[PDB]
Write a protein that binds this DNA or RNA. Structure first.
Ligand code: PDQ
Ligand code: PDQ
Ligand code: MG
Ligand code: MG
Lengths: 481, 222, 481, 222
DNA sequence: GACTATGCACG
DNA sequence: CGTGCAT
DNA sequence: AGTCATTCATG
DNA sequence: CATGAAT
């Protein structure tokens, strides 16, 4: 009982392990469904556990215990917090979890414990999971080796671009900003038709992001470079209005702040500019925001240096921030830095494989029912003989053999026949059967088209994408200058 | 620590005593901060009827309550809010904190109640909703109200039986139990003195043997 | 929007609510299964969730999330801690939860979080749940009104006496010490035969408790009064040995301490007697306990005042403690103070109702199969006619009517017949059927005996109790003086 | 805070550095307290290669480690244990803490390793059991060992794939990874110096760009 | 149920 | 200084 | 993941 | 000062 290993050979391997798992399976998004494993396990579990948006909300602690015991071998705090985030309209552009209770706020406060809250998945999240039950996607075993897990979701829209991601692993980081579902789908779609799409044209549809907190974004020149290379610096400015106050007084009102900034603290920093008297127009600073509205009123004194003051704040507080594009996702099991183009194409190809796989699944299911139906049809023409023969036999398997040797049915045909209950004998109508057969055969033709006819396939892809667009679209919140 | 109100007005300023940090958070979120304060009670409140004076003054909740309202405990009066409103879960443990709070108020801040400044707030017991983007929810506070609601929403509509304040959002909290024009509050009066002092002492008291009888004679265990 | 209520009328009602729920549904044991609702919900949920002792352990957080979301409307900490306790061989005499990982110790340390541990129910716990699936016991709706919950378990042994309980509610407390499963069952059994059992005779079988920590118990006179009235003071002394040390030195060794005392702290208090030099034989105090053994060695100096010293410690530290009987359980929905007798009788009657209810359940199930079987038998004699008639009909229900009007079968008979699959036609043997019919009828006779024949019923009760005894019995750990 | 050993003997005294308070608890439970100490590491360890000196000395874990072993950090030597043994989960995060610990030891306590006093302990990866009162469990640490075990236990026996130290008891911890006669330990030697200092710096270092290449060139992402 | 230190990359 | 999944 | 206060009865 | 289900 003793081993010798060098310090050199230990560190390399250990760090190797950690870096790997942290790079792939913890911190980085899949470029396809734009999910990190915790998120995906959350969606997948809540969904499997019929915790859909259309049914009653359910006790967060239950959701997590289930995720933790079945899929995600880590801390409940990690699972829960990540759950909570997905419930946050300000952080995500299309929230994927609905949570009842205190799930935090912009003023930065602490979400209530999983023991107080209740959650279900959202509506749009079902879309990511769409078709998962039709063998559309690669499954793995859970750590228990007791249950299987999707490595990726069917992703009925481009969540990666829409919701974004951040973003700290080993050797890489990732920051990706939210984007307008509608806009992104329009880009996606174009690229489907014209694959060799140049960035400039794609920019026409998808031009700059869309932060859930809205606000003003300037850096067209910069957004281009981001969408191109992957890295970019763009400028984000809260949205400003002027209000006039009875008494030769002027108020500066703010109704949108830059993505990912702490309204509670931002306010304190502004009042701090005033007390430490670092500018002239310092008067009163008031945060008057209630549910259903964000309003920050900074009122001035008499020498209304308004333009000077706002402009000062723009530099010296975070009322104006700078945002960074570091678009790093996992493609072919490895970290890649990427721009609108790869993040789009990878998506498309994914939907392709999904759609094909789905169709292959649907066709088989059909051809199997067709096969049984064809037999059911023959059986009717000899019903009397067949029944007598089942009676003659000695066991279930024996009858199945006799049907097969005698009348040349198949296995699957014999089995369906023999399990027929008695009341089914009540209706022996060649006609109704033949109608179903007809439908099955049109279904199969159609499927077989999407499978071996790339153009029609890409067509279906676009149809679905558009459908998702109409259902879920909403107007921009961020403005571009 | 207390979440204050932007303005100082003893004419119409509300002090909310909430059961638990988490619910208080939700409280701070939805609310008119122009004149209402959230002050949370981090778990089961000191029994100011079964605890020496040394302990009472040293208790974080109580002190914060005292210094936030102003008057003192003698007590003096108007500072500092013209409503002290108690917001707890509608459960047994919630009821227990109401017991503990009014005991304190009754014993020390006694004028406050007499002037009718102490209230208890009635969160809804039920939410009725009839899927997704088009969803409709209404609220009920009683046996009978739900009957009316169920008929209105008729078959197909699901009922939720709120287990606590944590189960509802800030907008929801506003609409039902905080917004002055929609809220339904209880107002504690006292309809004697001695009847009260006996009840408060038997129940909240250092005795037990009497509490037990009270429970035998009164708590109907069917 | 304003109501007026007095302070007098508010307090009474509110306190009423709390006291009630705390007295019944939180702090006090049911006199029958000796469970508190959290415990019972834990057992019931883990069991329903197939988390039995014979299958793999499962991630505590999962167990609790499930308990919390489905049954117990309270804090996870409360649910979990109570779970942990049930996993504790020193606190319970027959642990009802098996937990993997750090579930605490006697040296008083903090059990690991539910996010680290894994648990399953124990083996003996299945016994409490035994027969629950055969409508043996009263069910209620969960708070969701989505699922039903046992208000009491079938309780195949007297857990109340065996594991005990404490114990703090409103207006009442309860303290009950553990007892030897074997001994208690012997008492139970006697009382079944001789109902009017006097305490003195019952004491012969069940004489004094049995703490899992073993040790010495003195107070026969006192144990009598406890078992009689319900209240009692008995004396508990750790178990002491003398060891001789090369050098004219003497060591005092302790290998059992009184129920519910903190070995870590007890040790500190003993070393404290030494440093504060409150007695003479003060030398070194050492706790040398490792897994699989409790050993506390207090070694002396030279003037080996051994008898004087131990005796001093006996008073002044907790090496000797006093234990209190306050036996308060819930009978007929209300708190009662009780002694060996009521806690026994209530149990018996409970097993009675359970057993009868169980039998009623089993008999019905049988008579229903008998009824179908009798029909299956007739159908065979007319198989050919019947089949043709099912073919004639128009739907399932129509055939069922025709069988009923024509051949006078019943509903349940028609239904079983018509759902018969085709392969069943493979074997039309009046004989095998008749054999089953024969068994069913002997089963029913037997059941009907236990139902309407109190003596045989009480007999079965005793048989089962004895069986449980052999399986689960173990020798005493506490000694009586 | 540290859980000490009854006796003082630098000849054969073990210092266990455990990943997490909870596992440490289990560690303190099963063990020969006559000569082995548990010292838990409350979460992810300071990067003593990517943190100024001020921070390092201020870090609770590190200071406690330093004062408990004695020597210092210069370092001096024998005080105070004749084995420093690192016990972590067998997972990626466990491996990460091993990285962080040897970095520190390598950089500051460098003689300790050279004298071969630093060990890593190998908890089992698998438990094999074949119901209830009669149940049999055996342990495996590798791909191949489990093969041998599965054949022995043959069909019907269930396998457990330990996800961490928390999943096992104190008796179990003793038998497999603590009891000197049954434990299997790794002993860190260093087979150069410079090769080491480069590796330790590229990996654990304040640079990144190099770490990234190391990962590109070395981390096989299949 | 708040607080409290950490890694990991980056501006 | 702070981000967000991990300890 | 330790710590920290509180209720409720009782020796 | 604890105990053990609650906050
Ligand atoms: C320990 C520990 C901390 N501490 C306590 C003191 C200090 C230690 C000395 N490093 C840092 C700390 F400051 C925060 C956490 C924490 O947030 N979450 N979610 C946790 O699960 N843990 C535990 C590691 C599992 C925490
Ligand atoms: C708040 C609070 C405490 N505190 C912190 C300070 C003091 C406050 C001021 N009352 C009491 C405290 F010291 C312990 C707990 C606690 O153990 N468990 N399981 C909890 O859930 N909570 C919260 C009530 C829900 C606790
Ligand atoms: Mg509650
Ligand atoms: Mg781990």
């Amino acid at each position: 009982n003793i081993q010798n290993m060098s310090l050199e050979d230990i560190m390399g391997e250990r760090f190797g392990r950690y870096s790997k798992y942290i790079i792939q399976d913890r911190a980085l998004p899949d470029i396809r469904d734009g999910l990190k494993p915790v998120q995906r396990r959350i969606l997948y579990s809540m969904n499997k556990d019929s915790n859909t948006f259309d049914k009653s909300y359910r006790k967060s602690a239950k959701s997590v215990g289930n995720i933790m015991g079945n899929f995600h071998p880590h801390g409940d705090s990690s699972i829960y917090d990540a759950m909570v985030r997905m419930s946050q309209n300000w952080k995500n552009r299309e929230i994927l979890v609905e949570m009842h209770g205190n799930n935090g706020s912009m003023d930065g406060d602490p979400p209530a414990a999983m023991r107080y809250t209740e959650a279900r998945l959202s509506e749009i999240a079902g879309y990511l999971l769409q078709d998962i039950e039709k063998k559309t996607v690669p499954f793995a075993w859970n750590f228990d080796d007791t249950e299987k897990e999707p490595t990726v979701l069917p992703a009925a829209f481009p969540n990666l671009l829409v919701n974004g991601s951040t973003g700290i692993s080993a050797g890489y980081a990732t920051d990706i900003p939210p984007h307008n579902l509608a806009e992104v789908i329009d880009a996606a779609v174009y690229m489907i038709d014209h694959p060799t799409a140049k960035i400039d044209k794609l920019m026409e549809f998808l031009p700059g992001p869309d932060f859930p907190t809205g606000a003003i974004i300037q850096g067209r020149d910069e957004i281009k470079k981001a969408y191109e290379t992957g890295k970019g610096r763009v400028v984000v400015r809260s949205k400003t209005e002027i209000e006039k106050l009875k008494g030769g007084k002027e108020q500066i009102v703010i109704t949108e702040i830059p993505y990912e900034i702490n309204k509670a603290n931002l306010v304190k920093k502004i009042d701090d500019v005033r007390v430490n008297n670092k500018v002239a127009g310092i008067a009163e600073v008031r945060d008057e925001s209630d549910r259903d509205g964000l309003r920050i009123a900074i009122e001035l004194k008499k020498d209304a240096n308004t333009e000077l003051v706002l402009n000062y704040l723009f530099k010296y507080t975070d009322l104006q921030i700078n945002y960074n594009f570091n678009m790093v996702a996992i493609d072919n099991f490895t970290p890649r830095q990427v721009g609108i183009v790869p993040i789009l194409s990878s998506y498309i190809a994914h939907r392709r494989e999904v759609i094909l796989a789905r169709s292959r699944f649907d066709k088989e299911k059909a051809e199997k029912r067709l096969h049984i139906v064809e037999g059911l049809i023959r059986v009717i023409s000899i019903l009397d003989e067949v029944i007598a023969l089942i009676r003659a036999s000695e066991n279930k398997a024996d009858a199945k053999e006799n049907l097969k040797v005698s009348y040349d049915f198949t296995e699957e045909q014999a089995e369906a026949i023999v399990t027929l209950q008695l009341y089914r004998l009540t209706n022996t109508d060649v006609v109704v059967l033949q109608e179903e057969e007809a439908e099955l055969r049109e279904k199969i033709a159609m499927l077989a088209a999407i499978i071996g006819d790339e153009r029609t396939m890409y067509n279906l892809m676009k149809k679905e994408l558009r459908e998702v667009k109409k259902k879920f679209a909403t107007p921009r919140l961020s403005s571009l200058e | 620590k207390l979440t204050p109100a932007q303005s100082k007005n003893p004419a119409k300023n509300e002090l909310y005593l909430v059961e638990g940090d988490s619910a208080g958070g939700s409280a701070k979120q939805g609310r008119d901060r122009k004149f209402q304060a959230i002050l949370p009670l981090r778990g089961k409140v000191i029994n100011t009827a079964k605890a020496k004076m040394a302990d009472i003054l040293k208790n974080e909740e109580i002190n914060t309550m005292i210094y936030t309202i102003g008057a003192g405990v003698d007590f003096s009066i108007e500072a500092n809010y013209d409503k002290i409103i108690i917001m707890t879960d509608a459960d047994t443990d919630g009821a227990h904190i109401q017991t503990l709070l009014l005991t304190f108020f009754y014993r020390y801040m006694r004028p406050l109640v007499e002037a009718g400044h102490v209230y208890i707030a009635l969160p809804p017991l039920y939410k009725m909703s009839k899927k997704g983007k088009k969803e409709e929810v209404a609220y009920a506070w009683t046996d009978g109200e739900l009957e009316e609601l169920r008929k209105q929403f008729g078959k197909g509509a699901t009922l939720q039986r709120y287990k606590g304040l944590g189960e509802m959002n800030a907008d929801q909290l506003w609409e039902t139990t905080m917004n002055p024009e929609t809220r339904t509050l209880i107002r504690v009066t006292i309809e004697d003195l001695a009847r009260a002092e006996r009840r408060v002492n038997v129940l909240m008291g250092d005795k037990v043997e009497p509490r037990r009888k009270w429970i035998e004679d009164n708590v109907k265990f069917t």
